[PDB]
Symmetry: D2
Amino acid sequence: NNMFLVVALDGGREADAVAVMKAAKERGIKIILWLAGDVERLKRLFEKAKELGTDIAGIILDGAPLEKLRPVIKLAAEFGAALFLANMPDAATAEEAIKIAKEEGLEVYLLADLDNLDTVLALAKKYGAKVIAKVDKVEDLKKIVEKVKAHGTDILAGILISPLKPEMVDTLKKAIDELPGVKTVFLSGVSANPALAVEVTKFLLEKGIAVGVLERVPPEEVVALLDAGA
Amino acid sequence: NNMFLVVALDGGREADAVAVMKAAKERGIKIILWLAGDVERLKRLFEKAKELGTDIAGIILDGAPLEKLRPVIKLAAEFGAALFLANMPDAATAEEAIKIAKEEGLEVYLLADLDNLDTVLALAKKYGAKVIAKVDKVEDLKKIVEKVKAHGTDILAGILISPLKPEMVDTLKKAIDELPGVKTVFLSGVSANPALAVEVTKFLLEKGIAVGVLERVPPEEVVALLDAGA
Amino acid sequence: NNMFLVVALDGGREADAVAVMKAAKERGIKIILWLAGDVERLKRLFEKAKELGTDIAGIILDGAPLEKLRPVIKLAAEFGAALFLANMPDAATAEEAIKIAKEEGLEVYLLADLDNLDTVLALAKKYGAKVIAKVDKVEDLKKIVEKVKAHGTDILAGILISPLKPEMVDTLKKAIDELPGVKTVFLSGVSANPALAVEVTKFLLEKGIAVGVLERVPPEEVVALLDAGA
Amino acid sequence: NNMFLVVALDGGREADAVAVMKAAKERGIKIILWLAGDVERLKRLFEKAKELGTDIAGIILDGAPLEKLRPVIKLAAEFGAALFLANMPDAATAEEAIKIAKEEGLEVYLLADLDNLDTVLALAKKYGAKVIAKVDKVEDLKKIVEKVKAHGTDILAGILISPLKPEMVDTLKKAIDELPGVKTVFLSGVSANPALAVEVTKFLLEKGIAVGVLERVPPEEVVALLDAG
């Protein structure tokens, strides 16, 4: 019965970020933090989500430089969050980030679109991390299914479809049937066709797959979305 | 368990409407026809749904005049579709429509907003029809649960929330808990906040409630939405 | 510097349809009717639009068979509305509709997508009708300019972009520069990216091109959109 | 006329932010940066926008503390960007921010919703800054027009309507007729009804007012929005 909400809580007033976390806890929504650089705010968010009990399921380092990796990875370890790595600057920073995260006993997810899926798969076997595939074209999804069957379906834990196109719906259904490792599929809570979103949510829940909503807008907009102005 | 798709299949090319019915049957989506007056197209569509195996779960008369009721009601009875009545011109035209449909042994759903909800609950009791409540204001949910507990909770089978606003979410979550009769909830497939739509779909499916998607645009647009050009 | 609103005024409570026309007149919006078959309601809408002063700029026959062409065209001639023809069953029915419409002295626009653009340009050349080119693929745009230049830049009066996709924007800007005949561009008022809609509207208004908004949803929804519960 | 695009370029891969700025320049769109804390990335964005010719018209400090004000203000002054202030932590942080920005010769716009409009109006005249009003309820507009006429329509340079609801459209039109200081109106480029968006853009341009589109989503999403892959 899990629903994730990917939020970007490093901007705006911190009271808004905290209102997002409280409202999520109240609505049974697990939170993934998308990071924009503020590690002090990160530590305060970890503390206050503990106080509130909000489940910070994970944090995402997206294009983060090497000097920022270690404090973030240490905070994740202290508070028991999964680490997602995305758009890593170069192969050495990515390798270092996985190495330190595994040294800290972290659950590590590596995001990959088709272009560097092979690369990411390699790292995922080398350190024992899972992969989340990023699809924006139906063709990319078929190719990813091929490559993942060839490298083992239990390495792919999630799929992200940010432009959910009508022509993707059926292909995604079939892909999921061939990918028993996929635990979460992520859709845009901001710009996805509501009818396709309802249909795909229905399909995912029936298959026992969790739904993740991407909401990486300033926390003020999310406080409005969750009616958390109290 | 079920997903309904309310479509407006009058207008434009009939091959597009059939492509819609084909795509729905393939995707496990039950179809409700929103009628605009065309009784020949209604009969042709019923025939092709017979032919293809498509389930036409229901038909909607919206602001329908008296001269058009009987041919439509006869078609619904012949092919086994539920009759939804909305925005009936005056209480007598509604009376005639319910009476004729019940002479045909039809499932009758009466849409109602709050201001004339009481009337419709009464009428539904007079003829053994169910009611679908229209919510566009959070206070309406409290008032509706009241009036429905007053007239018996088994008379309310559905809720339609066409502007699904953030502040309604939690109130809806509870109101459904106080309305064990509600078997279907309807959302806009065109303009609903996708994040709220995902959350509300998850909640409904977990409660064993069906989701209906309002998609009353020309059939060519629905053909694009279901990627049904093939 | 005009704004058109393409509306589907059949199938409502009809008081909603007049409410739509009233609000459009108030707000400086020209109305184009998309027809779904009900010729009596068409007659009443023309009558009350006369009473209110509302400008029904045009009406759209979308997939009409031969027997429906003449009564509709009679109404268009009687009240002075331009005729848009789309999805004609065959070139012979299309010819019949254009022929009758010209015998009544109507302004005629022929909608065409890429596959049968040339044919429609030919017909428009034969009868002095204008063409509206339908875009759903970025590649189409260059081809349209090709096909239009072979027949003359004044024959194409409009463009319709039903899914306005990000890659189309710049290509559309240049294509519009290559086609001085374009007097109107049509966007989806329902499912267009608002940022892309703002940009393209700005570009058009700077070039003195009118904007058309497709809003072929039930008239109750258009009443909600224009807040016309007067 | 001008079109603004408020983007959140702190986060994700920096070349995505560069791709956004290049596409903006190519498409004739002025950029307003919504800041999330990364001041080194801010300096590099300023540098790259120089290189490309992109106009960084403005930057937004949203709930920023006092110690982050001065370096950000220095970047704005050095590169010629207006300073936007919103959701300031306390009245003193706001006072100091306006003080420092004016000491460096900066154009300062202060955001206010109805609830702290008067306060912000005061501050704006005390230091010579303009105000941008935030509207999310049709009722808020009557009250704002009142307060602004009482304090002078030359103080109101902008309006932001993030939930642009149908009932607001006509009221907004009427308020705009009474607010000749309004040079920019800001809409949500993400979740605003497209038909209403077109109507309002048409009306604003006819009155010579610029449109600002809010797109504070991560830069890969904005790179997708433009065709800058």
